[model samples]
Target chain A: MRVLLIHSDYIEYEVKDKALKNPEPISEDMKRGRMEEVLVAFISVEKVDEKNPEEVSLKAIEEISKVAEQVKAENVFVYPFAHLSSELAKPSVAMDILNRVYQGLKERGFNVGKAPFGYYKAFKISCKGHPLAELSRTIVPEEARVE
Target chain B: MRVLLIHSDYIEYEVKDKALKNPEPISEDMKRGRMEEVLVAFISVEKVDEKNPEEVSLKAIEEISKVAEQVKAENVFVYPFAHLSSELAKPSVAMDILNRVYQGLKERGFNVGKAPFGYYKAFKISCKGHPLAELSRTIVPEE
Candidate 1:
């Protein structure tokens, strides 16, 4: 069974594990060319309503999870991104969606990586490594020099 | 002369003076109903740029001052409401226009009041003797 992880840049939390380790997870070699990138995903929901947006958001996440399971994809990741402009994220709405989806997955007995920064979070879910890593490398190219 | 003040609500500052002892100056009570009142004005300015928006906003203030002066209104007040939704007393594109007008008046020896907060900025001008006081009262409305 594959583990799913969701991550976001909008999240602001101390990188407990990353900061504590001596040789950081991101090495000096990988530090040079990290740039902001955008990933677009067309999603569908069961229903949509202002008061019940979380239900719709989770419905979309669940659908993605089911497809990932069917294809035997190692892991599944779900998160939100603002349209084009990098404006402030709607915290209330994003939290609601993340909470619902996270709770649902955990209850189903699936291995899930909890997001430190819910909707603003993005993750690389791969079979053993990061699935979205390659796709993101194009935008944030694998850096060579680190200072 | 009648003067119109324009500003944002986020810049709340405390006035050192309280009642009688020079007082806080600006009258918060006068701003009672102005929680969402939109006042238009012209301000003085040197320039307007994407980064430095104050230039245009001042121009709007300047223009408003000029008009108020023409009508013999002495004081100008600016106020701010919630951005992105409430349009009352907002520092919109009009701020630039008002800036230019304000500049023209200042060059002619007229100085309109300027402050970060409008609700309590009434004391900046000579309120009691100012002809614009009645106009100011329109905002709060007598309870």
Candidate 2:
């Protein structure tokens, strides 16, 4: 999994036209919402990682938590950012992994929010200027086991 | 005060050739600045908030400080955005608040940058498509 972390003062987005032919419909409340002091993670799940979705999902959660702690984030937003890489996982597999990570983080006591997957949206953000505020990490089960 | 935050892969902006009659000339370095995996704050100062600029300015700093701590932001960009609200503060006052907040944040130790105030610049951002990747906040000073 490839993840990008950003510590931001706030973020606001509005759904524009759909990016995918059959994008998941966002809920009424989620169609547009804002959060404060959040660690926003843009995740991209790849085809090769589907070999062990469960492990990858768990490892992704772990890595996200570590960054969240560093940022002292009050809330988290996990967005499926497919543009990070061209080689992608099947839509179903990718959604599965994203959902699993979202649920796993919630169970771990993080205030987490998952963006509706497979959508083309426009957004704005206010980022804090700190050395550690933004980072990128790639996680794998084997790497986690080594720790 | 209204702030729009974007957790982006990168944000690049170049001053438009003719956005203002007498644009505040930016340093050559600032003319083109790019940061990766950064959160960019677009701030707009409204008329209502100008009633008590000093207190509101300080309060805005306090709020941004808390956010900076939580986000662990390494760098902050205070952009003077005028489009958030229909009612805007006097141009001078708005620039005053924007500059003050930038200075205050820097004094507090964050690596901060202030976009040239009172200029119309062009910007492009690559937003991370996460739920929290985008957010907005409205802040007011304390009594």
Candidate 3:
């Protein structure tokens, strides 16, 4: 997984169109979303992640959760920035990974939300380049580690 | 002034080309900027703002600072969303008003940065549409 973590004041986004042959079905609510004082994990699930979704998702959650603690923030918005990597997982598996991470974080007593997967989106945000405010990381499953 | 307030996770921007005949003279540092945990005042200075730049700027600061308090954020990024108004202020005066607000907020001890006024730019931001996270305001000079 490739993730760009941004500790933000807030985040708002509107769905534009489908970016894949089969897009995640969205409700009226999922069409757009906004959350205040959140850690936006702009993430991309890689092709290799399909074999071990749980491992990658948990690692993603762990990384994001730690930052949430460091930033002293409770709210999180799990958004997708899939282009961070050239090789992306199948949309179905990627969305599954996204949900697992979303669920993992929320279960940790954090108010979290996930952006719809496989869709084009537009958003506006602010993140100061502080020591811990912005960061990028890559994670992989221990069971199936690879280059 | 037309303002759209977005308390954001972070804001990143890079200056592109000039939008007016004569743009504000920018130092190398002014070309791009990024700030975290900030109240992003997406502001557009209007034509009527010319008569009383100070009043508008002060009001903008007051409004933004109030949100800062409500949001409990100490950082601010004063950015331009100029197309918000049809009758936009002249470039020079608009930048002037922008500066006044930037200075006012800083004097109050809020960590703040101002985006360049007369340039085409690109940015990525995260603004949640919370009750207080996303707001739009129109301000005018009282005096």
Candidate 4:
């Protein structure tokens, strides 16, 4: 998995249409949401994570955890993004990883908002290019070998 | 030249140390400043512009002008940045380009601010990624 973490002053989004045929259920409330002083995590579920998604997600959350603390971010916005990688995982597998990642951060006690998955949305983010605000992290599974 | 435009909620900077031995003069007032709801233009003066810095600067101002209006920017911050490209113009040529770009925008009625060049500075920008707000522009000198 690859992550682009942007510690932003605010993040606002409004869901528009489905990017996937069968997306995870979205609520009326989930259609639009905004948060201030947020850490927006743009994640790409890659083909590498297809094998051990749980392990990959764990590493992913840990990296995010590290950056969040370093940047002193109080809010976490998990934004599922596809542009970071060309080799992406299937929608079902990717969704599972996203869910687990969201839950992991929630368990860590950070105020978290996972953007509604499987939809095209219009969003804006205000990144406070602080020293540690804009960062990139790649999580590789333990003893992973790439052919 | 390569430019990365970030429309921001706020931008703050404080001059730290000289990036060049003989940098432009800096005063207490220009040493530090802050502004909000502005368009921050991070410009990289390139080697291609070395021969015709004036022409490049004109195109630079034009591109920035186009984006500023599209984003409805009231203030403009010209930041001379070196990270966007490896092929950079000499310090002398860069300073000239930056000055004209700053002056051109001011003439266009923008509340403009240009950070002192030839120095290292600590800075922060809260970029509002409004689609048009966080766009990139490249300028080529006219024939």
Candidate 5:
């Protein structure tokens, strides 16, 4: 997973349309939501790790947990962003991984919100300039050997 | 130069303080500005050919203008973003080039707003997601 962490003053997003031909209906809160002073994780689910998705999801959750603690952000927004990488996972696979990540975070007692997958959306964010406000990380499953 | 263009529903900004010890004072308009349905060009001034900044500036303007037109954005925002590239031009050189680009666009009759260079700012923007909402371009000066 490729992750970009932004500790922002606020972030607002509105879903517009389905990004694919067939997509699950977006919930009301995920359709349009606004939060103040949150940590937004812009995530890119890659093509390489669909076989070991659980490990990848766990690794991503671990990394994000550390970052959320560092920034003191109780609110977390998981946004699926394809622009971060050229090699992207299939929409179905990506959605599954994102759900796993979302559940993992919630089980850890963290407040989490997510933009609906496979939909076009608009977003507004106020990014802070503190050194730790913006960060990028690439996470891989531990003890995983790539052939 | 690497330019990241975002067609935003709206964008608002306020300059807070200098990012460096010696920085240019923020203009009244640049101190606080907001616009709707704008194309924001997040620019990374790379370490190259500072000798002919005007040529580079002109090239950037041409690319951004074309994108703004495609997005049907009447307003333009030129934002200096250092996170896009590791090799950045000197602060003074980059500021000079950005000013040139702003002037070029303004003379072309586009409503433009610019963030104050070399300053820490708070900004909010609603980014639209369409086929051309986000585009990337690399511009080089003519020989």
Candidate 6:
């Protein structure tokens, strides 16, 4: 719960649509929205290409972190933005973002969470249970009612 | 309209379930029926670590060609096997596979239909055609 949406090159309007849309059936737990409590964030990494991977990533992460504390978000969701001729985020591009975000989040003492999209739409499902443990609990109770 | 599910590992089972679950949110002329018309193929790429970038790209391109032709499939689906964690795949390993696949697919006269999971379960609210494109088609001249 308390998911953070991490995106690159995607507009805010699109982020709202993706968060509410029915998720892909990667895992049964995700499909039911057992972890829908998320804060979607976007990263404008569309123009990154081979020129400035780190700079773009840093800018995106910094922007996301600005409100990361405000939202009291526990999980982080990273989805791909529109590129090329397709709306589906390219896996290659997604994978690139995942490594950067994961490393960056960890560097900042954020525990890695579960993710649905391999290359795009990374859903941070777990947290370190530090100062925010109680809040995390509130978002997603210890007892996940799976019926 | 034709989708192909390709796995990098022994993911026949996962692929089956994913298909059954009806993952991507379609916004165009999408159709589904137990993969009725959809064709899927499987291929294993040689592992590519930080050291073996050459071998990694080589084997991957080869497999893309083989798998795509096997199904006459337009899309090449790359599934992460149980052995391959997202962490492991998230690194350049995943990119290598995709880059090679696209590079090879394009080289062999096949346009990169979609990159990686672009065709997979995604959110879309109908760009032109509906999910069930086949069902929605009208008989312009049914004799």
Q: Per model, how many backbone clashes are there? A: 60, 24, 24, 0, 0, 23
Write out fnat for all predictions, comma-separated: 0.00, 0.04, 0.16, 0.00, 0.42, 0.00
Which candidate do you rate higher for lDDT, 1 or 5?
5
**Maximum-DockQ candidate:** 5
Which candidate should be chosen as best, given TM-score against the real structure? 5
Evaluate every candidate with DockQ and list the scores. 0.01, 0.04, 0.08, 0.08, 0.34, 0.02
Please report, as a residue range, the 10-residue window in candidate 4 chain B with the lowest summed lDDT. B125-134
Interface RMSD of each: 27.6, 14.0, 13.4, 6.5, 2.7, 16.8
lDDT of 4 by residue, B1-143 (tens): 87778788888877777778788898889988888899989787888888787788888888898889999998999998764555788888888888989999998899998889987766666655444555666676856
Native RMSD of candidate 1 (Å): 23.1
Q: Is the docking of candidate 1 incorrect, acceptable, medium or high quality?
A: incorrect
Superposing all C-alpha atoms, what RMSD in Å does each candidate have to the true structure? 23.1, 17.8, 16.0, 7.3, 4.3, 19.8
TM-score for candidate 6, residues paired by index: 0.29
lDDT of 3 at A28: 88
Per-residue C-alpha lDDT of model 3 across residues B28-126, encoded as one tens digit per residue: 998888898888887879898998988888888898899899988899999876644557888888888888988999999999987887777756776
Q: Write the per-residue lDDT of candidate 6 for residues A11-76, one digit (tens) a residue.
A: 121111233234333544443222344434322233233244555456555545544566566545
lDDT of prediction 4: 0.79
Candidate 1's residue-wise lDDT over A1-147, tens digit each? 011121211111122222111322343433222112211121111112234555444554555456445444433333322221122224445445555665676565554433233212112211111222111100110121120
Please give, for every candidate in the order listed, the TM-score of chain B alone compared with the true chain B.
0.29, 0.84, 0.93, 0.96, 0.91, 0.39
Is model 4 an incorrect, acceptable, medium or high docking prediction? incorrect
Regions of candidate 6 where Cα sits further than 4 Å from its true position: A1-36, A42-44, A81-93, A111-147, B1-143
- What fraction of the real A-B contacts shows up in model 5? 0.42
Error of 4 at B78 (Å): 0.5
Q: In model 3, which regions exceed 4 Å deviation?
A: B1-143
TM-score of each: 0.25, 0.53, 0.53, 0.56, 0.76, 0.29
Off by over 4 Å in 1: A1-49, A83-89, A118-147, B1-143
